[PDB]
Coordinates of C-alpha atoms and ligand atoms in Angstrom, one line a residue:
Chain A
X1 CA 159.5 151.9 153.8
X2 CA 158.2 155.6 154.8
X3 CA 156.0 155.6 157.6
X4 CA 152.2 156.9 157.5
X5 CA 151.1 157.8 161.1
X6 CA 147.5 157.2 162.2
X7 CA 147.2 154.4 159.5
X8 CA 147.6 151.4 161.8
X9 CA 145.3 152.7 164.0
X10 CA 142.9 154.4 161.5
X11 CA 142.1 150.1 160.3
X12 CA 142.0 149.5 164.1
X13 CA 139.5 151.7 164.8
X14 CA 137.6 150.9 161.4
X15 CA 137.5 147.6 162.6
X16 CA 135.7 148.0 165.8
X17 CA 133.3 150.5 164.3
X18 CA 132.0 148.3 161.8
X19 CA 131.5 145.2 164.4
X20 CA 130.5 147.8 167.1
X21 CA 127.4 149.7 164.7
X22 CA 126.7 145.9 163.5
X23 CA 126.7 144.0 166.3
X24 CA 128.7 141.3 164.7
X25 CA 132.2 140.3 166.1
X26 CA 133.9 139.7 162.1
X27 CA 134.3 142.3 159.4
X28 CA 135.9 141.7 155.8
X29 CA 138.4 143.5 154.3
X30 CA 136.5 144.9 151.6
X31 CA 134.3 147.1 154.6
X32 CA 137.3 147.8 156.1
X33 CA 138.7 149.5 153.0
X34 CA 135.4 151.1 152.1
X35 CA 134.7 152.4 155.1
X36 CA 138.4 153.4 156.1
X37 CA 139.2 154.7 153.2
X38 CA 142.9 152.5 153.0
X39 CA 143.6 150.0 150.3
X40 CA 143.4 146.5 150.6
X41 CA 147.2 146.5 150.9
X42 CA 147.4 148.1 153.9
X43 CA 145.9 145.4 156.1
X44 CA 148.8 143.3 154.4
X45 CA 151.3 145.5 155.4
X46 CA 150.5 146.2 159.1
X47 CA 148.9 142.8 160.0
X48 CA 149.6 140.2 157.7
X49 CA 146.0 139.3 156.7
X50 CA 142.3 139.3 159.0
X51 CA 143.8 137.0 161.2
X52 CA 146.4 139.8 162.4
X53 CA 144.4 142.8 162.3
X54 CA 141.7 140.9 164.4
X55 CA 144.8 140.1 167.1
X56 CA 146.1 143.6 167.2
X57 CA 142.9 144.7 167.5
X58 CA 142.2 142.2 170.9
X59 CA 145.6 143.5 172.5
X60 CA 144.7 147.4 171.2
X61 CA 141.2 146.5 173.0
X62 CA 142.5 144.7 176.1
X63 CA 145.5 147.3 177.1
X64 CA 143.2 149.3 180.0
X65 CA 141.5 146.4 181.6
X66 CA 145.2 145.0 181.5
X67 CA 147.1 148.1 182.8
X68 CA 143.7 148.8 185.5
X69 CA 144.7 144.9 187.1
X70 CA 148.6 146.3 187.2
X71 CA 147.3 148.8 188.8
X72 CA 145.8 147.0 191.6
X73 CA 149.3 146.1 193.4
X74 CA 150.3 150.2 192.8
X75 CA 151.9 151.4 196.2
X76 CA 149.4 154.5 196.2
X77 CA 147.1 155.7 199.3
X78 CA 144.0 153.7 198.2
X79 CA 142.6 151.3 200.2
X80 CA 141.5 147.5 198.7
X81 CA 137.9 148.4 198.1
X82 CA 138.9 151.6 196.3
X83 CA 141.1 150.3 194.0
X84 CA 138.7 147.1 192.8
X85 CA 136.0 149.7 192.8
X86 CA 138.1 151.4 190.1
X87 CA 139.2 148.0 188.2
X88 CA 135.7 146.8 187.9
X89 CA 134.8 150.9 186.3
X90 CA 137.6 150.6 183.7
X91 CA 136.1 147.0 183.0
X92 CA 133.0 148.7 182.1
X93 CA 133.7 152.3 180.1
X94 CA 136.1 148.9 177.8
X95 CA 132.9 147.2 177.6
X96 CA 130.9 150.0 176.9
X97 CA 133.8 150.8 173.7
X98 CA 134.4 147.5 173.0
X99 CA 131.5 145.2 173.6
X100 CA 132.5 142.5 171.3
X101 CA 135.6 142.0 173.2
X102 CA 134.6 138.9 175.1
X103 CA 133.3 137.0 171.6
X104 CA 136.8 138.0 169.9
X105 CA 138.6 136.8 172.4
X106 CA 137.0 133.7 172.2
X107 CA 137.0 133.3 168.4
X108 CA 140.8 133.9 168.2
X109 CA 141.2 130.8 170.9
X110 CA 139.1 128.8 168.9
X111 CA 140.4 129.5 165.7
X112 CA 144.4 130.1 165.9
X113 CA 146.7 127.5 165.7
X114 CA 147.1 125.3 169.2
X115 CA 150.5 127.9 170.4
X116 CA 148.8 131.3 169.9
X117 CA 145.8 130.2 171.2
X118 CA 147.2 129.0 174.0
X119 CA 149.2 132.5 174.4
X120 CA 146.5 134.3 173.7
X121 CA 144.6 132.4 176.4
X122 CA 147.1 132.8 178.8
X123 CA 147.0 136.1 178.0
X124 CA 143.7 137.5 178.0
X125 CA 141.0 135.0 180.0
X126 CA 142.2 136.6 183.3
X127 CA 144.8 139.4 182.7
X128 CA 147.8 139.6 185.0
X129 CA 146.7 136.6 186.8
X130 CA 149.4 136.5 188.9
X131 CA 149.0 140.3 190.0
X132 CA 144.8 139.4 189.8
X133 CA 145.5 136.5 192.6
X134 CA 147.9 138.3 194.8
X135 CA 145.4 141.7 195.0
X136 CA 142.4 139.5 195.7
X137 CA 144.2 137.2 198.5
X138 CA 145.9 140.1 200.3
X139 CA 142.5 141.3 200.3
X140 CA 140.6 138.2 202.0
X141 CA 143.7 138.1 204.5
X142 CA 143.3 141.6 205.5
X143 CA 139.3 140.7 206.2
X144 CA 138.0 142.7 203.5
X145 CA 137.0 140.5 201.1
X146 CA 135.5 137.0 201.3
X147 CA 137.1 133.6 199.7
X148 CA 136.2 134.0 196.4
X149 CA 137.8 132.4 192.7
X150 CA 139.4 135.4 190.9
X151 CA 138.8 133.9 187.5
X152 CA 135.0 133.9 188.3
X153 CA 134.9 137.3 189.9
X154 CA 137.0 138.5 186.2
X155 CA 133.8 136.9 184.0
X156 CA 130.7 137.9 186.7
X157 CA 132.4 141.7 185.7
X158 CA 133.2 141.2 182.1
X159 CA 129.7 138.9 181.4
X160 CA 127.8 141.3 183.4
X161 CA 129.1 144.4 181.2
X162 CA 129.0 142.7 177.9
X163 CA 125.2 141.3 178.3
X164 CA 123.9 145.2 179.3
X165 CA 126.2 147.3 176.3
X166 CA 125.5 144.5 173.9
X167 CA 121.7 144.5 174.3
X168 CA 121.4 148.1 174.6
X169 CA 123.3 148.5 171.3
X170 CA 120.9 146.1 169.8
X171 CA 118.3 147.6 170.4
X172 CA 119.7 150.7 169.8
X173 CA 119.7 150.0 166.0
X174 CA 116.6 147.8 165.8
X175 CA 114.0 150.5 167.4
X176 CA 116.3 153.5 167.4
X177 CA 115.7 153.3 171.1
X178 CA 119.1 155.6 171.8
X179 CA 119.1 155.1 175.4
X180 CA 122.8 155.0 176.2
X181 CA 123.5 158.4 177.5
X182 CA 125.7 159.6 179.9
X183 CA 123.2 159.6 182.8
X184 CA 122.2 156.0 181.5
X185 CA 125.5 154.5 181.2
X186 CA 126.6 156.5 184.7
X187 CA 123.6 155.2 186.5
X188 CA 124.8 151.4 185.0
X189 CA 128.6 151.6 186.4
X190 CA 127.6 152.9 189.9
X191 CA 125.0 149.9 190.0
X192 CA 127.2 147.5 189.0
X193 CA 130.3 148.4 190.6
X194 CA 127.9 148.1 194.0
X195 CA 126.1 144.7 193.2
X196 CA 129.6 143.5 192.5
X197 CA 131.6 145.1 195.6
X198 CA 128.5 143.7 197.7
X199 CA 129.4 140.1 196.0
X200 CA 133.1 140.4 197.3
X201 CA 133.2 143.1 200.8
X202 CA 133.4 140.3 203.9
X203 CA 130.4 140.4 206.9
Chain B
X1 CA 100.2 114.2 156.6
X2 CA 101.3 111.5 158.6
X3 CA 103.1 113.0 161.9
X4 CA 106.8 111.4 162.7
X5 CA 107.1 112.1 166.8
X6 CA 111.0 112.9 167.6
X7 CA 111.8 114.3 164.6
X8 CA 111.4 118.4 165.1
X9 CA 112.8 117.6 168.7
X10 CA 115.8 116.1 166.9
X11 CA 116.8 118.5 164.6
X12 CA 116.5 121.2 167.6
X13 CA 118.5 119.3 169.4
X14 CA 121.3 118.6 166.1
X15 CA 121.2 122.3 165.5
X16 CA 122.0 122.8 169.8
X17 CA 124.6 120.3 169.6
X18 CA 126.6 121.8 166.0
X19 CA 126.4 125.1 168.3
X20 CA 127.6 123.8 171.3
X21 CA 130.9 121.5 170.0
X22 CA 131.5 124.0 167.4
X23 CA 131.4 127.2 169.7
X24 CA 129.4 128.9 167.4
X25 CA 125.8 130.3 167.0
X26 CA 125.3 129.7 163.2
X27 CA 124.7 126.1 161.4
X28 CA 123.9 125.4 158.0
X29 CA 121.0 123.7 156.7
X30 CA 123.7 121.1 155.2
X31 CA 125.5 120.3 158.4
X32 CA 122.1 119.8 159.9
X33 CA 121.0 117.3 157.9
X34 CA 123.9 115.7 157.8
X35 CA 124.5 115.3 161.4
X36 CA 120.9 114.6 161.8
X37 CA 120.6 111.9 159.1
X38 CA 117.6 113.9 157.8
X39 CA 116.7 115.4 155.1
X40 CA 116.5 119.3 153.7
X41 CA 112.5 118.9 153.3
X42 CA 112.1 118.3 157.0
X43 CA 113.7 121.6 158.3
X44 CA 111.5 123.1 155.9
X45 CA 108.1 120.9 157.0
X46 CA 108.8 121.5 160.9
X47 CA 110.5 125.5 160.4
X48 CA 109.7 127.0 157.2
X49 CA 113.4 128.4 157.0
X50 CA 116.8 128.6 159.3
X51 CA 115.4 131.5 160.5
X52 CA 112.1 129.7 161.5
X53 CA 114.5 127.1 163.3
X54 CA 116.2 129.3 165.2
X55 CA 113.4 131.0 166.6
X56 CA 112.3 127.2 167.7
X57 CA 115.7 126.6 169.3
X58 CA 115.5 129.7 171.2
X59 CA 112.3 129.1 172.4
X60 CA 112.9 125.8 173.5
X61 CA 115.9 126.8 175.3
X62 CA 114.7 129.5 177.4
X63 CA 111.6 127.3 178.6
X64 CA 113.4 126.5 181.8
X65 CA 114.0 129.4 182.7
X66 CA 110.8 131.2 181.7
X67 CA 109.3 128.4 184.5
X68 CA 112.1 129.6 186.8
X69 CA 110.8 132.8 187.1
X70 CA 107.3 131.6 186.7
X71 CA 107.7 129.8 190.6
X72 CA 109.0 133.0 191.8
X73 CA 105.5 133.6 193.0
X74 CA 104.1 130.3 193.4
X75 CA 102.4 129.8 196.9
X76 CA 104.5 127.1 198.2
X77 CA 107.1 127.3 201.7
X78 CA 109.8 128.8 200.3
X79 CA 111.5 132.3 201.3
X80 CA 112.2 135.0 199.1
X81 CA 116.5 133.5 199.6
X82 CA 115.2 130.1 198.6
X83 CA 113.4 130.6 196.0
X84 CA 115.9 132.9 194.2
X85 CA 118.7 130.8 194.5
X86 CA 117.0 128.1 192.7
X87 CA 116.2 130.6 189.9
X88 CA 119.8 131.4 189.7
X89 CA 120.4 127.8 189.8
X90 CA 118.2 127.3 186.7
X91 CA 119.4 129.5 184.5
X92 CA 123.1 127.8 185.6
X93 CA 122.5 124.5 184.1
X94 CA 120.6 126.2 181.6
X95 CA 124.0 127.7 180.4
X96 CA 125.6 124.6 180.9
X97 CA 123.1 123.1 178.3
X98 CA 123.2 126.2 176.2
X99 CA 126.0 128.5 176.3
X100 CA 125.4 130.2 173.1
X101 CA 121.9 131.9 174.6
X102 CA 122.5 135.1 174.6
X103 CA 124.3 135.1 171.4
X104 CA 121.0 133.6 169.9
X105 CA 119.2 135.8 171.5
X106 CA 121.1 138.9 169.9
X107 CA 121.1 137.8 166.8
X108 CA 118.0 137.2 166.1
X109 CA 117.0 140.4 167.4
X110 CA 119.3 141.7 165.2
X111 CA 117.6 140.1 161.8
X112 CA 114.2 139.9 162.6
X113 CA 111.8 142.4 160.8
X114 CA 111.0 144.9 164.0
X115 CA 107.7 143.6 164.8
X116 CA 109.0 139.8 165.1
X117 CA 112.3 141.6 167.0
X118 CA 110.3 143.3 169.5
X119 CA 108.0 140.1 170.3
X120 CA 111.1 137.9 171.1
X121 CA 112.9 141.3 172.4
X122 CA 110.0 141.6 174.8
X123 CA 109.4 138.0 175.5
X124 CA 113.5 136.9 176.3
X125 CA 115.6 140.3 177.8
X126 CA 114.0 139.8 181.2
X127 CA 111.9 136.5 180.8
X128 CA 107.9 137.1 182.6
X129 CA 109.2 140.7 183.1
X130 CA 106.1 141.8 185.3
X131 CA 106.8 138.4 188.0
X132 CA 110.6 139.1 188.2
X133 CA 109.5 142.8 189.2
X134 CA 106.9 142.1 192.0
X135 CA 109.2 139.0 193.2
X136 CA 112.0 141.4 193.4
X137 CA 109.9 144.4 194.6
X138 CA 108.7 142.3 197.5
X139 CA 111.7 140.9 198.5
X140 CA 112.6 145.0 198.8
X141 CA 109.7 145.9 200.4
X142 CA 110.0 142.9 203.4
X143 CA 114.3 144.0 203.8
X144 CA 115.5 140.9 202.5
X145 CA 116.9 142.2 199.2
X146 CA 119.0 145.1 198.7
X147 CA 117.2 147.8 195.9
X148 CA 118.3 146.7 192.2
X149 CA 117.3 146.4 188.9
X150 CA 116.1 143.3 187.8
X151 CA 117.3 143.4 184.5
X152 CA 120.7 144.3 185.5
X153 CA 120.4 141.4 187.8
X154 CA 119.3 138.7 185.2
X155 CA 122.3 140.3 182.8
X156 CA 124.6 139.9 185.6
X157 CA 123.3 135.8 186.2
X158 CA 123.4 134.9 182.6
X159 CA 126.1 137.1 181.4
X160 CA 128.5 135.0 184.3
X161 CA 127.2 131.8 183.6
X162 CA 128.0 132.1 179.9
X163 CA 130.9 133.4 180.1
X164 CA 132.0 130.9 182.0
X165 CA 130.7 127.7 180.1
X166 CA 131.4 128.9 176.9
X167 CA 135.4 129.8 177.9
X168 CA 135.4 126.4 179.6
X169 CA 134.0 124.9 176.1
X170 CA 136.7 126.6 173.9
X171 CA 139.4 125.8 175.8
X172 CA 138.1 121.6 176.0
X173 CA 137.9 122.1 172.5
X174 CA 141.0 123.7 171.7
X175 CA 143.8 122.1 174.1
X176 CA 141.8 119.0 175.2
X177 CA 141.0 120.1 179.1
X178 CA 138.1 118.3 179.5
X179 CA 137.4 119.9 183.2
X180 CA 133.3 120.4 183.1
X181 CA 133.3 117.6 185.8
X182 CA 130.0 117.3 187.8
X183 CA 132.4 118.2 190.7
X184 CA 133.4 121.4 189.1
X185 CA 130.0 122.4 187.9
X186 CA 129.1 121.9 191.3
X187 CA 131.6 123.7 192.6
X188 CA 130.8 126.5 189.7
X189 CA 127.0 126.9 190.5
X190 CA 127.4 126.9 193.9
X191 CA 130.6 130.0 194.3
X192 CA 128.4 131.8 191.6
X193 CA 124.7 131.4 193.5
X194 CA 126.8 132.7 196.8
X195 CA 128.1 135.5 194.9
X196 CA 125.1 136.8 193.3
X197 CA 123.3 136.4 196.6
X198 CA 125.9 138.1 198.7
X199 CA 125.1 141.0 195.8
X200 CA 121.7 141.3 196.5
X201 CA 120.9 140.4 200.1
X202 CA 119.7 143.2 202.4
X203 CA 122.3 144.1 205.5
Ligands
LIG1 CL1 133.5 155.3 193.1
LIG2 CL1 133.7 132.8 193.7
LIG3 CL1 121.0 125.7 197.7
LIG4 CL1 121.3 147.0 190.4

């Protein structure tokens, strides 16, 4: 087999165009090859079948919001405020690409077999949990944040993102009310990233 | 005709219930009836259509939580703290109830004609709109709260709460961990109401 670059990623992105513009988290093959522009064999090849190409396209999705929580145990200069300041921005500008990641997610879990589910799970409900738990903790023993439940602080982000990008896209395409510009969606990070930050910072 | 009390209540609450153990936002008219033990004339009697239904299980859904932010300004003891974190509180056990929400929301939106989409757009995406301002404005205005966006606010509730009930459905579902014990919901609503204050309270 000779190798085509761009392909893989061509159906990736093909894929969350179609359920992006639609606001619909499933697509069908047949889209995916007329809009792409890649024959029905192609999916085959790289993925396997929908199931696949809807996994790759989680993990493709998830790989900044997983590398931003690595990030948050990085021996840099930056204190503990700045660098969840940053992890809850990379949160959002996902969000704002992928705002459907939250249903996928959940539709894989529900509808894989009981071991990838549970991988997948693992995986993806709070990424890096381990790094997640020891960033947050370090953080309430230094006295900057209060006692909180990492896990719930990961979905108040990841909810909060997903309800706001969701409903402007709908709205978007059901008034042509194109609001989401980049004084919009700059004025929507810096708001959130403070209601959130005022949720964790102690006194 | 002859009017049967409990029967449109039922087949709201069929449709609710097929949503909620299936973690889904779709049901057929076959299901329904089936689950229900009534028949595909009934639907059609109380709804006109699916779409008709859904429209009737939206409504009845958000009715809590339109009353929620109705007693935002009621004249009883209450301070602006009180009364907001029994809002929140609301729309917790309203996700509890009805995780799929949103989702309904969305879609619905989504496949209306645009004059039905904007009524239930303008009605649902901040519920009595013009009280959750002046509550919020007020609060502002005596120092209590912080300056924020309601909406933002309300997406940042709802967003949470959903998130978390509807993973915490999937994975009972999928890996039978039953955890949605009246000891952790407690635990949930209250972590979450302390958060989102913390997020809004002035100093
Ligand atoms: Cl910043
Ligand atoms: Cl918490
Ligand atoms: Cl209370
Ligand atoms: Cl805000």
């Amino acid at each position: 087999n000779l190798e085509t670059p761009g392909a893989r990623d061509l159906l990736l992105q093909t894929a969350s165009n179609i359920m992006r513009e639609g606001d619909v988290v499933d697509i069908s093959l047949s889209e995916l090859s007329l809009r792409s522009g890649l024959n029905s064999a192609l999916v085959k090849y790289y993925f396997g079948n929908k199931a696949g190409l809807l996994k790759a396209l989680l993990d493709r999705d998830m790989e900044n919001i997983v590398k931003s929580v690595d990030a948050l145990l990085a021996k840099d200069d930056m204190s503990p405020e700045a660098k969840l300041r940053r992890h809850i921005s990379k949160c959002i500008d996902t969000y704002y690409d992928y705002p459907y990641l939250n249903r996928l997610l959940m539709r894989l879990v529900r509808d894989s077999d009981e071991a990838e589910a549970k991988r997948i799970a693992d995986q993806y409900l709070l990424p890096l949990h381990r790094a997640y738990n020891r960033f947050i903790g370090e953080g309430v023993k230094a006295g900057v944040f209060r006692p909180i439940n990492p896990q719930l602080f990961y979905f108040t982000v990841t909810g909060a993102a997903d309800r706001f990008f969701s409903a402007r896209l709908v709205l978007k395409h059901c008034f042509d009310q194109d609001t989401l510009t980049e004084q919009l969606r700059d004025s929507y990070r810096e708001h959130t990233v403070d209601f959130i930050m005022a949720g964790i910072l102690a006194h």
